Structure formats: structure tokens, C-alpha cells
Design a protein around this ligand. Structure first.
Ligand SMILES: CC[C@H](C)[C@H](N)C(=O)O
Length: 258
């Protein structure tokens, strides 16, 4: 079966990872295992989204890149000139994934370059590198399957962010729209009278201070809480603990300013 197993091994990981937010290191690791090579998933601008090392490289600059999660601008920018997979590039390629200062320490340095194509776009580049061993057709299939698969995920990552923002904004709209003029004013205060994402406050105290009805402060909080913008614990003899669940909310409360 040979290749059939490994290809499923990928599929396996992908289907495990649906549900959890995308993880690139884990994806890189899986590829490294099935392919038996160094894996680097590089963004359009050199951000190492994730990477897995199959054989360490004693080179301090290389060592920094992996720490800093970044590859040289020049090096990265030139990868977009690779339109299709370019396989088994020696140590003398501009595109080699091994250090150039030591082209003798890695004579047997083969780098394969595999574009990552998303929704019909070049999302990034999957770089594979190893010492000595050639990248055969059977290896190449697993690189390209892998690339395609990583491309899905890069796209899902954004998909989920923009969807989550959408959801957050909605909440804020729910809340704001539900609030009466006076209540809104009151909220502006309560959030003014603290500075943080959470905190405690007695409405009775706030009422007399700023000259607003206990009543409204109290209904105002009730609406925010029903929207999902916060959660409140009645703290009995003294006030009510208040925890903002929506970051976006308080920013919104500035934007309108009169
Ligand atoms: C990771 C980049 C590699 C090492 C490239 N050949 C360079 O020397 O910058």
C-alpha cells in the first residue's frame, strides 16, 4: 500500500484538527514524519507559520530565524518566482533552504520548493529540505497533498477570524441597540468609573455620585448582560461583580461621542 497509508495519515490529522483552531506546528510535524524531511511553512512575506526539524543545523543565523519565526525578506520574496513545484535543488540554488556561508558543510543539501495554493491564490510556500536523500515522485505526492492541505488551513484561519469578528460585532450591536438613551448614558459612566475588562461596583453609590437613577444603571447592566456583553454576580451587601465578555464593546462606546 506504501503511499496510500501516508496520504491517509495526512487526511487523519486534518480531520482531527477540524474543530480546534488551526495549528501549523502540528501540521508541519505530521508532514515531517510522513515525508522524512525538514518542513517550513512560509507566508507570503517570510513569517514561518510553523516548521518541524528532522535533522538539526548548527548555524547560529538559522538558529535565530526559527526563534524569531521569520526568514530573510529577500529569500522569501524570490520564492514567488517559483510557479510550480521545483524539486531537488542543490546547495548552489538561490532557493536552497540551507545556509550559504557553508556550501561545503551541506554539499549533499537537497531542497524542494512547493507552492501553496489556496482558493486559486498563492498563499505561501512549503519548503522541504534534507541531507543526501533525493525527493522521489512518491515523496512529491505527499508534499503536494500536504501543501494543498496546509493551504486549506491558512484560509480557514482567516475564515474563522473574520467570522468571529462578525459574531462579536453582532453582539455589540444587539446591546447598543437595546439600550435607551438614558441607559446608554449610564453605561458610558459605569465603564468610565472603571478602567479594565472587569471589576466591582455598587449602583447605589454610582447613582448619587453622578446623579443618575439606581434604576437605570441597574436596567442598563441587565441589558448588557442579556446581550452577552457582560456577566454579573450579585455580590449582596455590596454591589455586583461585572466582567466584560466583549472587548469590542467598550471601543464601540467611545466611537459615538456626544
Ligand atoms: C533559510 C534561508 C536560507 C538559509 C538561504 N539560502 C540563506 O542563506 O539565507
Amino acid at each position: 500500500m506504501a503511499s496510500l497509508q501516508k496520504t491517509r495519515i495526512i487526511n487523519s490529522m486534518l480531520q482531527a484538527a477540524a474543530g480546534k483552531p488551526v495549528n501549523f506546528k502540528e501540521m508541519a510535524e505530521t508532514l515531517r514524519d510522513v515525508i522524512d524531511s525538514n518542513i517550513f511553512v512560509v507566508s507570503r512575506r517570510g513569517k514561518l507559520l510553523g516548521y518541524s526539524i528532522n535533522q538539526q543545523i548548527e548555524n547560529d543565523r538559522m538558529k535565530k530565524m526559527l526563534e524569531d519565526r521569520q526568514f530573510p525578506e529577500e529569500y522569501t520574496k524570490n520564492l514567488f518566482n517559483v510557479p510550480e513545484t521545483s524539486s531537488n535543488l542543490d546547495i548552489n540554488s538561490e532557493y536552497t533552504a540551507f545556509p550559504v556561508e557553508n556550501r561545503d558543510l551541506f554539499q549533499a543539501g537537497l531542497t524542494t520548493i512547493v507552492p501553496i495554493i489556496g482558493g486559486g491564490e498563492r498563499l505561501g510556500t512549503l519548503i522541504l529540505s534534507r541531507l543526501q536523500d533525493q525527493f522521489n515522485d512518491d515523496d512529491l505526492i505527499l508534499a503536494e497533498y500536504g501543501a494543498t492541505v496546509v493551504g486549506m488551513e491558512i484560509l480557514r484561519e482567516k475564515a474563522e477570524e473574520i467570522e468571529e469578528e462578525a459574531r462579536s460585532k453582532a453582539v455589540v450591536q444587539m446591546a447598543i441597540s437595546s439600550l435607551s438613551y438614558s441607559e446608554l448614558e449610564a453605561i458610558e459612566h459605569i465603564f468610565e468609573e472603571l478602567d479594565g475588562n472587569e471589576g466591582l461596583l455598587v449602583a447605589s453609590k454610582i447613582a448619587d455620585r453622578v446623579g443618575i437613577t439606581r434604576s437605570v444603571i441597574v436596567n442598563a447592566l441587565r441589558k448588557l448582560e442579556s446581550a452577552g456583553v457582560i456577566e454579573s454576580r450579585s455580590l449582596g451587601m455590596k454591589g455586583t461583580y461585572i466582567k466584560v465578555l466583549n472587548n469590542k464593546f467598550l471601543i464601540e462606546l467611545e466611537n459615538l461621542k456626544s
